[PDB]
Amino acid sequence: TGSKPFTVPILTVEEMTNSRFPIPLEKLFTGPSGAFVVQPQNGRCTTDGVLLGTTQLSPVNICTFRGDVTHIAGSRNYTMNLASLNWNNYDPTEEIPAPLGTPDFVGKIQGLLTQTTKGDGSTRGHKATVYTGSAPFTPKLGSVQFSTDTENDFETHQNTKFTPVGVIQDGSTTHRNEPQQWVLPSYSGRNVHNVHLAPAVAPTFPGEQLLFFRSTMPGCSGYPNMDLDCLLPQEWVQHFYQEAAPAQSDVALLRFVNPDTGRVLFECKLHKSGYVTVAHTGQHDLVIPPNGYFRFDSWVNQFYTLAPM
Amino acid sequence: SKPFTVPILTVEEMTNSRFPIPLEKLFTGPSGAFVVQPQNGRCTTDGVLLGTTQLSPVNICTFRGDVTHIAGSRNYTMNLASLNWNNYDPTEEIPAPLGTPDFVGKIQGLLTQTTKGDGSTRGHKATVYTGSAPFTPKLGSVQFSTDTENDFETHQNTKFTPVGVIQDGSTTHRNEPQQWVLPSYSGRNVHNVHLAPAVAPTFPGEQLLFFRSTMPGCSGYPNMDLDCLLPQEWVQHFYQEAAPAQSDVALLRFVNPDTGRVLFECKLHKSGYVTVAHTGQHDLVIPPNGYFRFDSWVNQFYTLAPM
């Protein structure tokens, strides 16, 4: 009695943003997930607005890094000592897995590393790639490495930003073998256990699968696997964070409605810990009308049987 | 009537509606001497998108299409597609494709491409000069300068992801970008159409309140300041809520949770911009947890407490 009514945004899928990389959502996808552990750290939020993992609120502070850089002699690599979003000191003892927004998959993320010299406002920018499966990827410790197209242009002790664009793959190896979107980086480096993680999720009900919000990351070199699935759109993270409507049960029943025809396409379970399941067996790209949207209908529980998708 | 609200997200939790970067601060200054007519980040309080405004925080200053190499150069012409990768339609009554840059500047980022057949991919640093003669997005074409003469393929999906801005370092520092100069969306001899209107304070002692970011600089000595009239999250919020405006102005109070006190009040005009009572340039100093709260509908001629 007296709970703030729960709701989800009325934005359509194509009007929303992937919570794991700064690109629009394209489609909904469902498939079996017994062959991987689904434990992304971005795009994690409970329905009552508790951010989990490395999740933060900005759609354009995801897979970014800020700090200052040191050149590694004999190479085009730079070590970035990480700062916070507002350029303050990074605190490695905060009870999070890594700075909020840190990439949550193993892959080679390419973008631009940019810098401004405080004294005169001179600026510079270079193509750069961060290898999140590599030994120098230690964001939790406050340090990551970038491979760039320069050995001398970046200055020390000047604010430097990495803006992600897409992913690459080693073209001499099996096509689409990376990125591995369901493999978490080791945030503190090789053989150091991750901490404070958002939990892995899986369907529990017979005949159910996770429902993913899917985008295609830009590819920047080689033959990458560009598929990227998030559990919640970034706008849903922002919505629940603000609304903070109490979860009246374990499961919010949503209906996906077509306002063009006035008919419900399918129903799904939004679990209070922040993920969606549907009743379907097999890999399936959902086909949805551009104006279709999710609408909260009622609180049910994990024993509720969904109508087949 | 449906109660009007603004998001409770703090400034640094929100996104610039004119370039895909976080908001950093609030800024006010006089703007009588020139025209404030941005086309992105334009939305009425009852949720009507204006100008070139669309809903995505990460489909702003992006481009998509097919590219063709200009022989004897490292420049490529992009024939624009839509977000769904369909043919572009120049007869829509908009100034240019939604999300088109709304300032004159040299925007640098990466041009990326996927070959459909084998999934091979490529990516190159590229710059679009929105003040250049070939910048004709309303006509379905813009030009990029890149670092290759041969790597991009024809008739393959190509995307530009913006990162920051550059300036010609052999010229007066910070002389470009010019954030308050609109591109000529159809080229230099064709006037712009279907624009969201220019905005100005009219009430004595008031100035615009800007939501400000610093665009990354990628070369030279650029002016990196970028002011939007509404955070992108406010655009998304009004679009969904569609709460009718009960008067010309929504009075907002900016509240500090650490004290429980109002820091300042401002006017959110129903056509989608904010004013404060202040004379002079000022970077507002705000607590990280400060937020805007709608307090009441007032008329346009309400007198604000001084900022």
Ligand SMILES: CC(=O)N[C@@H]1[C@@H](O[C@@H]2O[C@H](CO)[C@H](O)[C@H](O)[C@H]2O[C@@H]2O[C@@H](C)[C@@H](O)[C@@H](O)[C@@H]2O)[C@H](O[C@@H]2O[C@@H](C)[C@@H](O)[C@@H](O)[C@@H]2O)[C@@H](CO)O[C@H]1O
């Ligand atoms: C121009 C081209 O196709 N070159 C092939 C080469 O791929 C290029 O390799 C260099 C390093 O030597 C850079 O990594 C380039 O980014 C890369 O080219 C990109 O990727 C290829 C697949 C094309 O889509 C191209 O248009 C694009 O610019 C390739 O090298 C292998 O693959 C690359 C990605 C890299 O992992 C190399 O270490 C690896 O040996 C070789 C052999 O596959 O073939 C060249 O023709």
Ligand SMILES: CC(=O)N[C@@H]1[C@@H](O[C@@H]2O[C@H](CO)[C@H](O)[C@H](O)[C@H]2O[C@@H]2O[C@@H](C)[C@@H](O)[C@@H](O)[C@@H]2O)[C@H](O[C@@H]2O[C@@H](C)[C@@H](O)[C@@H](O)[C@@H]2O)[C@@H](CO)O[C@H]1O
């Ligand atoms: C290495 C350096 O500082 N060079 C200055 C030069 O700037 C470089 O010019 C080339 C073009 O010839 C490229 O545009 C480079 O990106 C540019 O270097 C960038 O910008 C400078 C200001 C530094 O921050 C540097 O670290 C960064 O990589 C510069 O040339 C003027 O400005 C550039 C942006 C370009 O517009 C030139 O056409 C223009 O003459 C000159 C004069 O300011 O000074 C050199 O020292």
